[PDB]
A paper describes a structure:
Pab87 is a serine protease belonging to the MEROPS S12 family and displays sequence similarity with penicillin-recognizing proteins, termed PRP. Pab87 is the first characterized member of a new self-compartmentalizing protease family, referred to as CubicO proteases as they display a cubic-shaped octameric form. In conclusion, Pab87 is a hyperthermophilic peptidase that acts on d-amino acid containing peptides at N- and C-termini. Taken all together, we propose that CubicO proteases play a central role in proteolysis of these bacterial cell debris that contains d-amino acids.
The Pab87 structure was determined at 2.2 Å resolution using the single-wavelength anomalous dispersion method with anomalous signal of a high-phasing-power lanthanide derivative, the Lu-HPDO3A complex. The crystal structure of the P. abyssi CubicO protease (Pab87) reveals a 422 symmetry, where the eight monomers are arranged in a barrel-shaped architecture. In the protease complex, monomers associate through a non-crystallographic four-fold axis to form two stacked tetramers that are themselves related by a non-crystallographic two-fold axis perpendicular to the latter. The 50.4 kDa monomer of Pab87 consists of two structural domains, an N-terminal PRP domain associated to a C-terminal lipocalin domain that plays a crucial role in the octamerization and in the active site compartmentalization. The N-terminal domain structure follows the pattern of the known PRP structures, composed of two regions, one α/β and one all-helical region with six helices. The Pab87 C-terminal domain presents a typical lipocalin superfold that consists of an α-helix and an eight-stranded antiparallel β-barrel. Each monomer interacts with four other subunits of the octamer but main interactions are observed within the head-to-tail dimers, where monomers interact primarily with each other by shape recognition through key-lock type interaction. Intersubunit contacts are formed by electrostatic and hydrogen-bonding interactions between the bottom of the lipocalin domain of the first monomer and the all-helical region of the PRP domain of the second monomer. The 20 Å wide square-shaped channel, running along the four-fold axis through the entire complex, joins the equatorial two-fold axes into a 60 Å wide central cavern formed by association of the eight C-terminal domains. Each active site, facing the central cavern, lies between three domains, the PRP and the lipocalin domains of one monomer, and the second lipocalin domain of a head-to-tail dimer.
Author numbering:
A (entry chain H), B (entry chain B): 1 to 447
C (entry chain E): 1 to 446
The structure:
């Protein structure tokens, strides 16, 4: 693998955005072949991020919840077709149709997101909202009426729902007899030798290699924020890239120490399509996203985010390779770093084969100030994600147009905007460090 | 025609958009059957707008310039295929091809807008721009190197160019032997009885029924702005809807007072398609815009704008009907009012036939604040013209998503945004004073 | 009891008012049948509120001071009709008539509030005023001219006076011979087994489950503020809902391990009416508020607030049920939560029988943007407590009008502002995500 290219990419992005620290581990053929730390785990104390640094892993915790569910099913404790009402005291039969365990694992209950995690975490970092659900029990209470929020029968649509996995946590406690955190620690963490993976504040703050979370304010300052303890089965586990390596190894080598291979495969089966089509055909299994078209391979993985911490794990069983990335802020998507490394491992050029990388580079070239014939009319071009904003300069006048890219090339971009029902086009021609923009009746040259 | 309906429309829009005054005239098979003024021609003085109120007509002046060319051509003064260099001393042979009179009239020289008029007027109204071309001579001097601005060969592409008509004005002088203003006055205005159509401020000062222009500032306060004297052949004429009534009559009835009917038809011929598709397949003639599919009819017209004054004239030769509208601000498109009236005259409901009208009504219903489950997350939806903007409420954080309407119905709007290079939908379900928004994983409900 | 309805209520209210954490206990027939903590004890450290969590209880402390006085009276230490001057070195003979122990207990000395507590706490939280009374002895010195502050003869009117209970704390010291803190701990807390109820910071610092106080600033931010140590007899006690359930049990069952039942009945007697009339007839006993018409029952209770902490305790002797709620901010009246629960324990619907509950839900339907015929004029309706404000939009102008709701139903509300000496009426009609407003000559639609 081209380590030089990967490391530059990481440092480049960390500077570009204001990311404090990042840790990464890479598995190949059964062994961890690469594990490094970048930046700081704590800016205030000047503590570096290391391969052993502990970060919140967010929704990566979902796959653990699903694995625990698989084990309980295999031991005959319950059935994937069992209605959730059989295990939890809550109304879950929208339109008369029973939402089952399977529906919850696949976010196909028919109930859109309750926005509970969004409201909760925003408040815990100084935002405007507030949702003090200190325990999953209080979350369930708040969700007493989630049934009335349904907009589709169970099994028809996909709606990423955090509350859904919170209910699965409760289902694990009902069936097993112990607390969710207990079950995960004794049936998964210990048997896998993951000793630096925790749920409790008491054990984390005692560790010596833990990352402090960070949020960038509107002013560009990195503000420290501790983990938002309270979340559990949907995304409350804290861990390191080295511990996630042992976890990924189990899946890749189809190790049957937790469940039989038949069950690991149930988790990797795409059951429903998701709205985030990146490489084409993306779907969802049990607590894992499925990318059947990732550079010629079927990719399996999931992202995580608790606001001041983000992460991503991913593996490709047919190639025996996996990657884990943890970050102490949300400046740059961990999945992108992970996919960059995976692309290099497969022998593909990430700068060319990854849409979100390829698109971002070209669009950045188009940004700047634009002038018409001999400087008559002036314009401003700024990119905000997938969109290109064209704003005519003037303290007192002009408009603003959002442009959608229809064609992206190293030296040419064609976008359209919406004017009177049909699309109006704008073309960007990129050459000798110069950019010609053609829009409607105008011609504008960069600068 | 259902007048009560038309009048309500106009008063309602003038209020909604803060338009100070409007005048309109309607012609039906030979006579002016409706001429009426609305609002104020001068707000500070409390002077009302009347059928005789004088306004700047902007680009409607282009047709006058084109008509004068037709006359000179019918007289053997010049040919439409002659290269411009034959009459004006300036280089106009981009890529080795001669720009002809025909190219100038159809905006097909291959030279995109120089943006001169935008710069000029912006500076004359207090903008941060500045281009003091107080005469067409000065403008031609500035456009000296416009041949190098060319991006296409003559006749292949449409680019609305004001300087193109400034050149036609100079061609009229060279050939006719008199000034552009005198030729237009002597060969068109006078023989058509348009005695209150001027070019010179000295004439305008004498007139007793003249409208002051207005521009709305960043604070929604109407600011008076006088006409920007200096522009001529491309948009410097000032007239009334009654004078334009006599003008439209000539075209409709194919009156040969100035030129043979064969030449009027040359002007109504679609030579090149334009990017202003409203009803489908619109094109450009000579100083006139062609709409081959306007409510099952062929519409001919042209808008005009000098910033503080706007206008429009259009006619349907086959139905012998025409309409003229003048406004002393840029608040509401005069063409929309003119088309509203035309629809009524055609026996059609403008509320169901004109896109720019129902599309505006339907979109308003989606604006407001939306709330997630039990008020967890908040969003505000705002419509700017034809785009729907979805913004998340929070002072610390706040992302805005541009939504483009795809399916538009009375009770359902489906929009899309871009992400990862693919479109992602947002559905708006409108029902009994409330709207349900379904975007990605979320469900948001309005009031 | 319908617990789900109660827990959904609390979470929703905490979200709505930005309350950090709440703890509550419910006692029935001598057993703690329910006790839970919601939200956060300490936001910054992310520690959950629990039934054990300790909070300042504020003026709930007053009932302890009253109980202490009852014991001393029963033991012959003093008389309820004794002038307070007989125990404290201060002038208290407004209008030539001595303020008695009884007068202080009922807030009827004839002396209006000195605003000492308001000034004290305000300054201790970074506010504008300042009154550095670090000890109750200091407050008394400050209160040296209080006699001159009187406006009525003792026993005629009610004026909640915190200094009143400060003087009582000193009286307790004079009679017993020990300090107020020691007297309460040895005579009340210890015999009742209330082992996690404190006065001193040295003790609270050693407790592992304690909440941080919070105050919401003007940007809507929760600002941490530690307990303002210094106050004592009028409201310096810190405790938890589990210890308070033990306290409530004594009154409910009329346990006589501290005083005889005749003295508990003295404390629960309505001696004078209060202006805080919620259900009708509310009065004040001895460090206790009396509600004679609470859902067809006689409720006894008292609230408390120290600024960054609030709480409430209430019990209904006849139904052997009591409730305690503590909060680490003043976002939502803890008495409202307590009464919500008592209503459920009574087989009643709080959503339809508690005024402060439905009135707030209904007045909420009215908030919004209103416009006249085809958008000619714009107005804004915003609710603030009980008053509905109607403002004419438009930057240059934008006057305001206060509207006092006279009639209030599910889909209708009649209010009145004040004109030229007479009441001008406004009516709101609510029907299907729509509200019509008739105000004088105008008709406005939201
Ligand atoms: C968890 C899976 O059971 C879900 N299932 C995955 C595929 N199953 C095969 C299988 O059951 O492993 C296909 C046949 N399945 C028959 C049946 O199971 O009753 C009907 C559809 N099921 C509905 C259901 O679950 O009941 C949808 C998804
Ligand atoms: C049992 C009685 O003591 C009750 N008492 C009967 C009337 N008393 C006159 C009297 O008691 O001879 C007059 C008013 N009394 C002041 C006073 O006693 O001088 C105030 C309130 N009293 C309680 C108290 O005195 O603590 C309540 C009613
Ligand atoms: Lu490089
Ligand atoms: Lu099945
Ligand atoms: Lu030809
Ligand atoms: Lu002739
Ligand atoms: Lu008495
Ligand atoms: Lu005894």
């Amino acid at each position: 693998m081209d380590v030089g290219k990967l490391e530059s990419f990481i440092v480049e992005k960390m500077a570009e955005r204001k990311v404090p620290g990042i840790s990464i581990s890479i598995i190949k053929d059964g062994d961890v072949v690469y594990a490094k730390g970048f930046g700081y785990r704590n800016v205030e104390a000047r503590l570096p991020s290391t391969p052993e640094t502990i970060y919140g892993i967010g929704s990566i915790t979902k796959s653990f919840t699903a694995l625990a569910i698989m084990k309980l099913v295999e031991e005959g404790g319950l059935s994937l077709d069992d209605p959730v009402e059989k295990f939890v005291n809550i109304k879950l039969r929208p339109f008369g149709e029973p939402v089952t365990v399977h529906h919850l694992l696949t976010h196909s209950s028919g109930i859109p997101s309750l926005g509970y995690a969004e409201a909760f975490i925003d408040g815990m970092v100084g935002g405007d909202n507030w949702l003090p659900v200190s325990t999953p029990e209080e979350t369930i209470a708040f969700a007493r009426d989630m049934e009335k929020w349904a907009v589709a029968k169970p099994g028809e649509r996909f709606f990423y729902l955090n509350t859904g996995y919170v209910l699965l946590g409760k289902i694990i406690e009902k069936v097993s007899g112990v607390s969710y955190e207990e079950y995960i620690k004794k049936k998964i963490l210990e048997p896998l030798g993951m000793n630096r993976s925790y749920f409790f504040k008491e054990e984390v703050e005692k560790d010596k290699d833990v990352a402090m979370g960070y949020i960038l304010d509107k002013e560009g300052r990195l503000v420290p924020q501790p983990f938002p303890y309270g979340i559990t089965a949907d995304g409350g586990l804290l861990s390191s890239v080295l511990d996630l390596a042992k976890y990924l190894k189990m899946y890749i080598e189809r190790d049957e120490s937790i469940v039989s291979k038949e069950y690991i495969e149930k988790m990797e089966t795409s059951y429903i399509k998701v709205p985030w089509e990146i490489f084409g055909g993306e779907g969802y299994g049990y607590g894992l996203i499925i990318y059947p078209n990732f550079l010629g391979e079927k990719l399996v993985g999931h992202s995580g985010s608790v606001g001041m911490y983000t992460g991503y794990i991913g593996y490709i069983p047919e190639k025996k390779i996996g990657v884990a990335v943890l970050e102490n802020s949300s400046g740059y998507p961990p999945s992108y770093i992970a996919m960059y490394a995976l692309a290099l491992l497969l022998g593909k050029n990430p700068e060319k084969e990854l849409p979100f990388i390829y698109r971002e580079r070209i669009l950045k070239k188009v940004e700047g100030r634009y002038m018409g014939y001999k400087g008559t009319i002036k314009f401003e071009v700024k990119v905000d994600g997938d969109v290109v904003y064209l704003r005519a300069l003037g303290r007192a006048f002009t408009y603003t147009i959002p442009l959608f890219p229809e064609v992206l090339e190293e030296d040419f971009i064609k976008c359209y905007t919406l004017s009177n029902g049909r699309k109006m086009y704008a073309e960007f021609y990129i050459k000798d460090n110069k950019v010609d923009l053609i829009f409607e009746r105008y011609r504008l040259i960069k600068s």
